[PDB]
Design a protein around this ligand. Structure first.
Ligand SMILES: *P(=O)(O)OC[C@@H]1O[C@H](n2ccc(N)nc2=O)CS1
Ligand code: NA
Ligand code: NA
Ligand code: NA
Ligand code: NA
Ligand code: NA
Length: 317
DNA sequence: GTCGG
DNA sequence: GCTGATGCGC
DNA sequence: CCGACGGCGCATCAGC
């Protein structure tokens, strides 16, 4: 599955410059679509024309592939990689909270590196400071073992605040994956429905700060919390990395739609979405009509009440 | 940049 | 001060 | 040729 990796690296490299430097998000997704269709292609590509056959690979990406195969490089990438301005803008967006627009502004003012960021705490907002502070940790994957320990803590403390909460760690983790990029937790409580927040999210966040699991807050409102956490390590062991954790308060009757959605995979979702006359979003499933007019959303008490309706487990996905 | 109305 | 627009992460 | 390409919660900015 690494058979066109040079081609795939190139395309992802091009993708990020469109996103972070050119600010062309559709070009970004075009290069990424092209990269992943190629990454799944079971042969070593020999020509751009061979690749052009795949959906998401067009004439310009096929030309690029021909230049890359003939020379092992792309003049445009070589060039843009040398460029002080653009390289810097690209790199700074790796800090969580620095998007393409903040990156450009910093580089305009001569702030180009992490050091530069450090020397100017004042010019960054809260999220950006936390992303700087944990820059290295956030780029690390989380082994399954550590996620299990993190899960242990979350369920214990959620249940302790109130035994009637229901919390589920979603993401790749729930799919059995050997590692994860962060922790996505979905939270509900029987007294929170589509027509209902009484500090339900807040008092959970607070409990996990109280036992020193949550260490920082990127953002926090009534339904979505974004922050940082860390496992305790014993007296004379090296610290675990700081880790990203999100917690979502969803109403009881949308939980399982939410669960499914944040369970992923992104691939299987977009897939089963289009796959019959039903439409699905993170919240609900609605039946259509003639034009395609969504009727009222259907009740749900489980994940598998949804595997009724298209005639369609997380292990697989 | 690629697709498709 | 308040409303809506934009930036951002995912 | 020429528009679609994803949408939503929170923080923060621009404007009144
Ligand atoms: P994060 O990287 O934790 O992804 C998990 C969930 O998937 C959904 N998702 C992923 C990527 C993007 N671009 N958009 C998106 O909605 C929601 S968070
Ligand atoms: Na641009
Ligand atoms: Na094609
Ligand atoms: Na960023
Ligand atoms: Na995730
Ligand atoms: Na992730």
């Amino acid at each position: 599955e690494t058979l066109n990796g040079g081609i795939t690296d190139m395309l992802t490299e091009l993708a990020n410059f469109e996103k972070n430097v050119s600010q062309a998000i559709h070009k970004y997704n075009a290069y990424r679509k092209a990269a992943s269709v190629i990454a799944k292609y079971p042969h070593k590509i020999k020509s751009g024309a061979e690749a052009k056959k795949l959906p998401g690979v067009g004439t310009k990406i096929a030309e690029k592939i021909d230049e890359f195969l003939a020379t092992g490089k792309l003049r445009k990438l070589e060039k843009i990689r040398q460029d002080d301005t653009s390289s810097s803008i690209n790199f700074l967006t790796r800090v969580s909270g620095i998007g393409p627009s903040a990156a450009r502004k910093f580089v305009d003012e001569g702030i180009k590196t992490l050091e530069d960021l450090r020397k100017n705490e004042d010019k960054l907002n809260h999220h950006q400071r936390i992303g700087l502070k944990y820059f290295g940790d956030f780029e690390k994957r989380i082994p399954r073992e550590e996620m299990l320990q993190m899960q242990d803590i979350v369920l214990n403390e959620v249940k302790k605040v109130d035994s009637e909460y229901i919390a589920t760690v979603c993401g790749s983790f729930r799919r059995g994956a050997e590692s994860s990029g962060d922790m996505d937790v979905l939270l509900t409580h029987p007294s929170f429905t589509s027509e209902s927040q009484p500090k339900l999210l807040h008092q959970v966040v607070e409990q996990l700060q109280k036992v020193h699991f949550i260490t920082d807050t990127l953002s926090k409102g009534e339904t979505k919390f974004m922050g940082v956490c860390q496992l305790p390590s014993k007296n004379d062991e090296k610290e675990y990395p700081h880790r990203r954790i999100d917690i979502r308060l969803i109403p009881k009757d949308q939980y399982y739609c939410g669960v499914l959605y944040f369970t992923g995979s992104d691939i299987f979702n977009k897939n089963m979405r289009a796959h019959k006359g039903f439409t699905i979003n993170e919240y609900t499933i609605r039946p259509l009509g003639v034009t395609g007019v969504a009727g009222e959303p259907l009740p749900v008490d489980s994940e598998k009440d949804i595997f009724d309706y298209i005639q369609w487990e997380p292990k697989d996905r």
